[PDB]
Write a protein that binds this ligand. Structure first.
Ligand code: CLA
Ligand code: CLA
Ligand code: CLA
Ligand code: CLA
Ligand code: CLA
Ligand code: CLA
Ligand code: CLA
Ligand code: CLA
Ligand SMILES: CCCCCCCCCCCCCCCC(=O)OC[C@H](COP(=O)(O)OC[C@@H](O)CO)OC(=O)CCCCCCCCCCCCCCC
Ligand SMILES: CCCCCCCCCCCCCCCC(=O)OC[C@H](COP(=O)(O)OC[C@@H](O)CO)OC(=O)CCCCCCCCCCCCCCC
Ligand code: SF4
Ligand code: SF4
Lengths: 141, 136, 34, 61, 45, 31, 742, 74, 80
């Protein structure tokens, strides 16, 4: 797109960097397979692949696929932590259960965390996702 | 004015400076059942006398720290004086004759507000008036 | 040919104004009249 | 306001303003802040009790 | 074994569960980057 | 090259006027 | 009384119950968390055994067991370093060519491109070049192959497990009484004799039988495969007599005091071995023998169960004079009833000793091929300087903790401690004066020099070509040491170190050690050192002497060792505690030692280290620029910090790239410290209030209430990141620069 | 002098009169074609005064005296 | 001097009088609490402003408050 972006296959600087390619892992062809993967990206004038994050599906693997994958994993984590905190408030020793986890409570919660978007929609539509503003504390104005 | 024996210590440089002769000076008196070692508020060890003791000090807080220490020696008859350069000796602690932790009759409420603190007015309501928000 | 004014004004700004100013301000902040 | 009844604080200066507390005891001496209320949360001083008036409380049931 | 219950309550404490869980997570990431290195983007068909 | 001696002397004499007015204003602001 | 073994049987049961109870040891922590303050208090109170129990016997038992656990930690570390030298190093390739192979352990696994760090160190090996000098230590031990390193590592692991079992044993099974610990005379006798004199005598035995023969064969040019095993010098006597002919006479010249036949292997040469640049192994063995005899005799001083000897208490009772009142009367009871007074003395004098070790091990290089390994020399000097500075600060901390907790006015009455309290205004105001004086006449001369050089006035500076300040007393002491092998040490051949004088010793075409000439810049920097040391002393001594009281706050001992303030009144009383004085003294220790190690680095690179030609002239690393550049702050900034940090910034894409990364990340941590040091916790608690609101809205709120750090924890975190970042920057800078140019 | 070559002539802020300067410093700041030691101006006041029509030193002088009387007015 | 004022939410537990290092505070008779006592500050000229009384107070936000004001030799805590 912008500021002299060519495909990596057409760029002489990318093919100049591809010859002297350090091996990332123990196999000798990591440096060659790295540039063979990165050849389909767009390329700056110095030879480096520039990602395009505007949202088109030609470049969806640059940012859109990591976005959906991250949001799924982070929603899993935050949802499971929320559900565990709400699970242990009914037990009357809640502070002890935060420094010492109950595995018998936590492990079904981390197992059931694959359906966090469905559960989050079902809790948003039910109104149990949030508390009322008059029921939580605030400071003097 | 004040009768008492100076406690036994060889002197410190932490004692009382020119403010004593020019501005104000404090004294603490107490009686002891026996001669024993206490710590000065100025730093160092000193032996109190069996009988009446007198120890001139620079600040009142020195006397109340020492009187808090003398309670560990089961001594509760200590008195703190304020001495001016004119020689004017006034009796300040305990002023009433009873320690301030105990209620005594004849004491009046000083600087009592008959409201909770969240009921103080705003600063802009009291602006240019010469009063504070917490007054009265 | 007024370049000689610097050898007057720079010593005045650097010595005479600080001495007179700090002397006034010192005797003013130590004064008990006003 | 009864002993053992869940109440909510209406004192704005309090640590537990708009937060649920539990009544411990109520004094009948005609004093201004008779109701002793206990909390699960402690304040910044580490204390979880305070005296309140009847006007500073609403019952939570 | 009553001491085994004590060991399970020890493993369930916050720093020990943290070091076990983050060791497992870091090990998964390290092993994935051993076998499949250099994934700047997801490659497309 | 530059301006003359007469112009520097005249500018100093003119600068005595905001000096005197600044003295009066600073004393008035204190008063 | 008498010194006997007395031991309780099974005091504490061995059970995992209290591992499930975090904070079981304090009565306040054992209730459980209500805020996040509890979690940090579980760590700040974890080793403060006085808050655990009040009785001194249980505290002493906990200390003795924790010492065994700590020795087990150090032994695991030591045997792990020896195991990396065994399995993952080029040690055997380094023995064959010490001048051209760089020492390296720690091969790095290839995962994310970090096998760039496995650089070509030589000997057919790729790995991280090490700077701790384990290789020189092992060559001085006489170790010639990897299997001896494996046996040493396995022995270290067995010794570590034995220490760990000993700690378990003396806490749970057989715990000593309090009167066992208070036999300080018996402890001093056994330490000075067995731990030091018998240890130095056994090490003299090793140096005579194993180290000096093997190192003499290595220096003669024999290959390390042709050098016989060290037990074959004991079996076959003719090899020793072929190396050292004094072994032909046997043990009979020892007992008949005919010690002159042993002069083959017990020398007094001085100087350095011209092949290795290290000390002579015969001198080192003779040293350990003489030291062994002195410590064995010294450990017979104190009285035990047989009448003869000394009471340390009686020695202390006698030493009173006219100025000092009752003398050292109560000081025995302070050191026998308080572990903090002992930790103050042992930590301050062991930190001073560690600094002394740094100076001695640069100037008289003990190990073979240590002097021409410039990287190891710089790193072990600067390492031991930092360790010594930290331990001195810890000694001052525990002096303040003694004054707050364990000090007794009844015991310490009219003695030296009671009297130094009673004129602390005199001491502290005079130390205040010495610090202001030295700050002017050390740093203000640099400011004068910067201004004079900036104004185009080099003749008005303090330099060698202008107003001269010659360090004339240190020049005098150097001349007296150069002339000592003639008359004031007739049986020495060469001076104690070449740093005082006596010509240039070159090993491998590089300067091992040469005379360190002292001019105006050395005068200026020694007074910078005197100034920064004195300010550090001012802070730490003012913390200890005012730990209990001051004019400002008379009951400071009631508030404790570690408290933030006594509130905003009486002017403002932030940072009056003993902890806070340790806190500020940490910064000044950092400042001082940073200037110490910068002085070492630039002085040794500019005036000592470098190459020697066949003509004999020495070309140094930075070219002698210390004399004219180090007298200005601009010269330091330019020719030391800008010029020598070219190697750590130009190091991406090389094997030294981790040091560039650590250089930047240490700058990050040092800058991150200033968030904690400059701010305060009322802001942060009010910010946590809005974050806790946003959690209470979404019903994700912990029962453990989020709190900001305490005031003291804000200070501790800030100074910890300040020290971590500032020292790791100097670490990465020293490493990348000296691994390039050394 | 800056009028006839704004690209190659350094503007002058003011003169230096400093008795602390040694002779190499006095030589080092005798720059931009000046008779003595001077400071170079970096505030762009030459470009601004040249753009808005000023051409001589007398015009700058009358500007400064006008601002002296204008400050007297305030 | 500083200004120390006592609000009506006092419970009379006398902890501010005990915490005070300079004897500012005393307990007086009262009838608005169960302990029948408030704290009172007659000697605010001895007040250094260290706020140990506010540290010692158990009520939810402070039956007693210190308002820092003009500085004297006593309020600054100078022995000279
Ligand atoms: C249960 C876990 C959890 C969840 C769901 C949230 C949720 C939230 N936090 Mg968060 N927080 C947490 C833990 C959590 N927090 C912890 C432990 C800390 C202390 C480090 C913080 C510190 C924190 C700050 C400082 C801020 C938030 C903010 C927020 C909000 C915006 C999202 C965000 O910034 O996330 C990002 C949160 C972080 C990067 C903090 C670390 C998160 C950790 C790594 C996850 C905890 C994992 C948990 C312990 C696992 C439990 C599993 C269980 C089965 C045992 C959102 C309401 C922001 C806000 O108020 O926005 C309106 C904000 O400013 N939080
Ligand atoms: C901004 C105004 C200013 C001015 C105009 C001067 C002017 C001078 N300074 Mg000074 N100085 C100043 C600020 C200033 N200073 C400040 C703020 C500092 C602190 C950083 C210094 C620190 C400083 C030092 C340390 C020295 C000077 C010296 C000098 C002299 C120049 C060197 C020389 O060859 O003369 C030589 C001329 C003489 C020796 C004749 C002295 C002039 C007579 C005594 C004037 C009488 C005035 C008296 C108060 C009445 C000159 C008189 C040097 C000097 O020689 O001064 C003694 C010198 O040693 N200055
Ligand atoms: C927040 C900033 C940030 C971001 C966005 C990234 C992003 C990335 N880093 Mg990076 N990195 C960061 C901080 C960050 N890093 C920091 C702070 C450092 C220094 C310690 C590094 C050091 C670093 C190195 C040294 C390397 C990366 C690599 C990568 C790439 C990930 C390859 C991978 O494993 O994906 C694939 C991951 C998954 C498929 C996740 C699977 C998780 C589970 C199993 C899935 C479960 C399914 C439901 C990606 C572009 C690597 C790379 O490929 O280079 C481009 C690489 O070699 N980074
Ligand atoms: C733009 C700058 C500026 C202006 C217009 C003012 C204006 C004022 N200041 Mg002020 N002030 C300033 C900067 C300024 N200040 C700064 C930077 C400081 C910090 C040091 C102060 C510190 C300060 C103090 C401490 C006091 C004032 C006072 C005053 C008032 C009277 C001034 C006076 O006594 O003149 C006296 C000055 C002169 C006569 C000098 C004039 C000589 C020239 C050559 C003519 C006036 C409202 C005073 C006030 O309000 O008291 C009622 C007062 O006590 N100011
Ligand atoms: C104490 C000093 C010390 C240090 C700093 C190291 C450091 C290292 N060793 Mg090492 N080692 C040591 C002692 C030491 N060792 C000793 C004493 C031995 C003899 C037993 C060895 C034997 C050894 C071998 C045989 C190897 C290493 C290797 C390594 C490297 C990688 C280790 C790694 O990734 O672990 C991975 C770490 C973990 C998986 C941590 C698990 C964390 C758990 C969950 C914590 C449990 C807490 C709680 C109780 C539950 C690393 C440089 C390897 C290497 O390649 O070196 C070049 C290698 O092959 N070491
Ligand atoms: C703890 C130290 C230590 C130990 C274990 C030994 C052990 C030994 N030495 Mg010895 N030695 C030592 C220190 C030590 N030495 C010191 C410090 C010196 C110098 C004074 C000597 C000087 C010495 C000589 C001169 C000889 C021995 C010999 C011996 C061996 C036989 C001793 C004997 O006959 O009875 C034995 C291996 C003899 C031997 O067999 O040589 C191998 C022998 O001739 N030693
Ligand atoms: C032989 C050495 C020695 C010993 C036994 C002690 C022992 C003690 N000290 Mg002490 N101290 C020492 C050296 C020593 N210190 C030194 C060298 C200093 C100066 C730096 C101090 C300064 C000092 C102060 C100022 C205080 C103590 C206190 C204490 C007591 C409680 C310690 C505790 O609970 O641990 C708690 C330990 C921790 C919570 C660990 C802290 C982690 C550190 C700060 C970070 C380390 C970073 C690491 C080196 C590198 C980064 C790694 C990272 C990435 C993981 C205990 C009696 C305290 C006390 O109450 O005394 C009675 C106290 O207030 N000491
Ligand atoms: C570069 C920064 C810097 C500087 C200059 C200082 C300066 C000083 N600190 Mg320090 N300090 C610093 C950073 C610094 N600190 C930091 C970061 C901390 C935080 C931990 C501290 C914490 C700290 C403590 C805790 C202590 C000090 C102390 C001191 C004093 C040392 C003794 C003395 O008088 O020195 C001599 C003075 C100097 C070297 C300053 C420069 C003097 C110049 C060169 C000469 C004057 C120039 C000129 C004549 C003036 C011209 C004026 C012009 C307007 C006319 C001094 C005032 C100690 C102290 O007060 O003990 C007496 C002390 O106890 N400091
Ligand atoms: C240069 C600053 C010199 C100030 C001292 C003035 C000497 C006047 C001497 C003189 O004119 O005295 C006359 C003038 C009027 O006061 P009197 O002397 O009448 O004093 C009696 C009064 O107490 C009125 O009752 O005194 C003051 O202005 C003194 C107060 C100055 C207070 C300082 C305020 C100015 C500070 C702000 C300027 C500094 C910041 C710089 C801004 C760029
Ligand atoms: C702590 C570090 C020392 C810094 C202090 C230096 C400046 C301070 C001046 C001292 C003021 C008063 C001192 C106490 C006043 C005092 O008590 O005087 C009296 C004291 C002797 O007191 P007594 O006669 O009562 O002896 C009784 C003793 O048993 C103690 O009770 O004399 C000295 O200690 C003078 C020593 C001066 C200290 C300087 C010597 C330092 C040793 C240097 C050796 C290092 C190796 C050098 C190798 C070349
Ligand atoms: S709250 Fe903080 S700033 Fe204030 S006096 Fe205490 S320690 Fe100092
Ligand atoms: S601020 Fe200090 S002196 Fe004043 S009332 Fe409180 S505790 Fe007493």
């Amino acid at each position: 797109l912008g500021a002299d972006l060519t495909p990596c296959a057409e760029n002489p600087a990318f093919q100049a960097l591809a010859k002297n390619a350090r091996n990332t892992t123990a196999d000798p062809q990591s440096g060659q397979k790295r540039f063979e993967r990165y050849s389909q990206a767009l390329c700056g004038p110095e030879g480096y692949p520039h990602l395009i994050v505007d949202g088109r599906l030609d470049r969806a693997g640059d940012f859109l696929i990591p976005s959906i994958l991250f949001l799924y994993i982070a929603g899993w984590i935050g949802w499971v932590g929320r559900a565990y905190l709400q699970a242990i408030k009914k037990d009357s020793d809640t502070e002890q259960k935060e420094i010492q986890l109950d595995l018998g409570i936590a492990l079904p919660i981390i197992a059931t965390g694959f359906a966090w978007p469905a559960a989050a929609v079902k809790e948003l539509l039910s109104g149990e996702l949030t508390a009322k503003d008059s029921e939580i504390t605030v400071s003097p104005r | 004015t004040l009768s008492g024996k100076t406690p036994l210590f060889a002197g410190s440089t932490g004692g009382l400076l020119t403010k004593a002769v020019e501005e104000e000076k404090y004294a603490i008196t107490w009686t002891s059942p026996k001669a024993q070692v206490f710590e000065l508020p100025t730093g160092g060890a000193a032996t109190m006398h069996e009988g009446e003791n007198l120890l001139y000090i620079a600040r009142k807080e020195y006397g109340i720290a020492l009187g808090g220490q003398l309670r560990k020696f089961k001594i509760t008859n200590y008195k703190i004086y304020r001495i001016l350069p004119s020689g004017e000796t006034t009796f300040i602690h305990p002023a009433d004759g009873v320690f301030p932790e105990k209620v005594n009759a004849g004491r009046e409420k000083v600087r009592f507000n008959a409201r909770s603190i969240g009921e103080n007015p705003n600063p802009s309501q009291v602006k240019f008036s010469g009063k504070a928000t917490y007054d009265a | 040919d007024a370049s000689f004014l610097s050898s007057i004004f720079v010593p005045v700004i650097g010595w005479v104004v600080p001495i007179a100013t700090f002397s006034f301000l010192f005797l003013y902040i130590e004064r008990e009249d006003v | 306001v009864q002993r053992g009844s869940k109440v909510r604080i209406l004192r704005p200066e309090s640590y537990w303003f708009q937060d649920v507390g539990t009544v411990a005891s109520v004094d009948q001496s005609g004093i201004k802040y008779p109701v002793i209320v206990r909390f699960d949360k402690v304040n910044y001083a580490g204390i979880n009790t305070n005296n309140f008036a009847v006007d500073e409380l609403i019952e939570v049931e | 074994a009553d001491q085994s219950s004590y060991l399970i309550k020890f493993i369930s404490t916050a720093p020990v569960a943290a070091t076990i869980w983050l060791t497992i997570t870091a090990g998964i990431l390290i092993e994935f980057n051993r076998f499949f290195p250099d994934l700047l983007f997801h490659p497309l068909p | 090259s530059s301006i003359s001696d007469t112009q520097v002397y005249i500018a100093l004499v003119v600068a005595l006027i905001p000096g005197l007015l600044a003295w009066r204003l600073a004393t008035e602001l204190y008063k | 009384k008498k010194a006997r073994v007395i031991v309780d049987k099974d005091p504490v049961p061995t059970s995992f119950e209290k591992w499930a109870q975090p904070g079981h040891f304090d009565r306040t922590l054992a209730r459980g968390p209500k805020t996040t303050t509890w979690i940090w208090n579980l760590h700040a109170l974890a080793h403060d055994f006085d808050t655990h129990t009040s009785d001194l016997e249980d505290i002493s038992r906990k200390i003795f067991a924790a010492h065994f656990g700590h020795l087990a930690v150090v032994t695991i570390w030591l045997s792990g370093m020896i195991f990396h030298g065994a399995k993952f190093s080029n040690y055997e390739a380094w023995l064959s060519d010490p001048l051209n192979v760089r020492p390296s352990a720690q091969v790095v696994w290839p995962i994310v491109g970090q096998d760039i760090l496995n650089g070509d160190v030589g000997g057919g090996f790729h790995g991280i070049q090490i700077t701790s000098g384990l290789f020189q230590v092992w060559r001085g031990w006489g170790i010639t192959n990897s299997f001896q390193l494996y046996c040493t590592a396995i022995g270290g692991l067995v010794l570590a497990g034995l220490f760990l079992f000993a700690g378990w044993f003396h806490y749970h099974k057989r715990a000593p009484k309090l009167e066992w610990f208070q036999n300080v005379e018996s402890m001093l006798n056994h330490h000075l004799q067995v731990l030091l004199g018998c240890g130095s005598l056994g090490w003299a035995g090793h140096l005579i039988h194993v180290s000096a023969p093997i190192n003499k064969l290595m220096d003669a040019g024999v290959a390390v495969k042709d050098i016989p095993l060290p037990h074959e010098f004991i079996l076959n006597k003719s090899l020793l007599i072929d190396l050292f002919p004094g072994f032909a006479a046997g043990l009979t010249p020892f007992f008949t005091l005919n010690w002159g036949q042993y002069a083959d292997f017990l020398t007094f040469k001085g100087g350095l071995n011209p092949v290795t640049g290290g000390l002579w192994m015969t001198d080192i063995a003779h040293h350990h023998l003489a030291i062994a005899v002195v410590f064995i005799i010294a450990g017979h001083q104190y009285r035990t169960n047989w009448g003869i000897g000394h009471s340390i208490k009686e020695i202390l009772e006698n030493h009173k004079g006219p100025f000092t009142g009752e003398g050292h009367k109560g000081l025995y009871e302070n050191l026998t009833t308080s572990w903090h007074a002992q930790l103050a003395t042992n930590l301050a004098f062991l930190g001073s000793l560690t600094i002394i070790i740094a100076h001695h091990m640069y100037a008289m290089p003990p190990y073979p091929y240590l002097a021409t390994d410039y990287a190891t020399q710089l790193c072990i000097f600067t390492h031991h300087i930092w360790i010594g500075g930290f331990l001195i600060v810890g000694g001052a901390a525990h002096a303040a903790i003694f004054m707050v907790r364990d000090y007794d006015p009844v015991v310490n009455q009219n003695n030296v401690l009671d009297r130094v309290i009673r004129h602390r205004d005199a001491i502290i105001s005079h130390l205040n004066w010495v610090c202001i004086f030295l700050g002017f006449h050390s740093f203000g001369l640099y400011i004068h020099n910067d201004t004079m050089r900036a104004l185009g006035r080099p003749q008005d500076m303090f330099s060698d070509t202008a107003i001269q300040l010659q360090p004339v007393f240190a020049q005098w002491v150097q001349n007296l040491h150069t002339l000592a092998p003639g008359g004031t040490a007739p049986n020495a051949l060469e001076p104690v170190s070449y740093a005082f004088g006596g010509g240039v010793l070159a090993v491998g075409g590089k300067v091992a050690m040469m005379p360190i000439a002292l001019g105006t810049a050395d005068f200026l920097i020694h007074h910078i050192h005197a100034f920064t040391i004195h300010v550090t002393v001012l802070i730490l001594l003012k913390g200890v002497l005012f730990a209990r009281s001051s004019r400002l706050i008379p009951d400071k001992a009631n508030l404790g060792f570690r408290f933030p303030c006594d509130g905003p009144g009486r002017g403002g009383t932030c940072q009056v505690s003993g902890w806070d004085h340790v806190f500020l003294g940490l910064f000044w220790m950092y400042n001082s030692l940073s200037i110490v190690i910068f002085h070492f680095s630039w002085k040794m690179q500019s005036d000592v280290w470098g190459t020697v030609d066949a003509a004999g002239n020495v070309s140094h690393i930075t070219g002698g620029n210390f004399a004219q550049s180090a007298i200005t702050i601009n010269g330091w900034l330019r020719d030391f910090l800008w010029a020598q940090a070219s190697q750590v910034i130009n190091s991406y894409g090389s094997a030294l790239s981790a040091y560039g990364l650590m250089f930047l990340g240490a700058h990050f941590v040092w800058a991150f410290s200033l968030m904690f040091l400059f701010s305060g916790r009322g802001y942060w608690q009010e910010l946590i209030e809005s974050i806790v609101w946003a959690h209470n809205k979404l019903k994700v709120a912990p029962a453990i209430q989020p709190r900001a750090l305490s005031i003291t924890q804000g200070r501790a975190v800030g100074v910890a990141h300040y020290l971590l970042g500032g020292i790791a920057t100097t670490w990465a800078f020293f490493h990348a620069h000296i691994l390039s140019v050394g | 002098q800056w009028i006839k070559d704004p690209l190659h002539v350094r503007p002058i802020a003011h003169a230096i009169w400093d008795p602390h300067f040694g002779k190499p410093a006095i030589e080092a700041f005798t720059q931009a074609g000046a008779n003595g030691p001077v400071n170079i101006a970096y505030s762009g006041v030459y470009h601004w005064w040249y753009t808005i029509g000023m051409r001589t030193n007398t015009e700058l002088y009358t500007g400064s005296v006008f601002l002296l009387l204008f400050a007297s007015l305030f | 001097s500083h200004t120390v004022k006592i609000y009506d939410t006092c419970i009379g537990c006398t902890q501010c009088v005990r915490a005070c290092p300079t004897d500012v505070l005393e307990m007086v008779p009262w009838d608005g609490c169960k302990a029948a006592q408030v704290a009172s500050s007659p000697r605010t000229e001895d007040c250094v402003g260290c706020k140990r009384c506010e540290t010692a107070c158990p009520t939810d936000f402070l039956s007693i408050r210190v308002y820092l004001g003009a500085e004297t030799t006593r309020s600054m805590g100078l022995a000279y």
